[PDB]
């Protein structure tokens, strides 16, 4: 059974369970933004359906050695998470907010 992560707002296909990545040994990280809100961040090696906004930034990065850019759903513009770059093994990956996705069957 393929298990698809869809944009919770609009239903667009974004990623799948098979594309989870154990970043630092763990494909689901618990992180705090600077306002103190807690996110569960799924780590994916690949994703579809995403528009990236801005130049990379390293500030506040939750993943050492990686800079982020904001990832929006291309269809509806929901803020789904971030793309990470500038690392090694892998160079890049996606960190997507669990509450902003919905996991279900194909
Ligand atoms: O790895 C990341 C991605 C971006 C994220 N981030 C936020 O969630 C945020 C909210 C408010 C102002 C500034 C930021 C910031 O860098 C953050 O804290 N770390
Ligand atoms: Ca975890
Ligand atoms: Cl899958
Ligand atoms: Cl990590
Ligand atoms: Cl964690
Ligand atoms: Cl944190
Ligand atoms: Cl969350
Ligand atoms: Cl952000
Ligand atoms: Cl949103
Ligand atoms: Ni895993
Ligand atoms: Zn969407």
Numbering used by the authors: 18 to 123
The paper states:
Ito et al. showed that cereblon associates with damaged DNA binding protein 1 (DDB1) to act as a substrate receptor for the DDB1/cullin4 E3 ubiquitin ligase complex. In mammals, cereblon has a LON domain and a C-terminal thalidomide binding domain. However, homologs of the latter, also termed the CULT domain, are further found in animals and bacteria as single-domain proteins, that have all essential residues of the thalidomide binding site conserved. Architecturally, the thalidomide binding domain is a member of the β-tent fold, which consists of two antiparallel beta sheets that are oriented at an approximately right angle and pinned together at the top via a structural zinc ion.
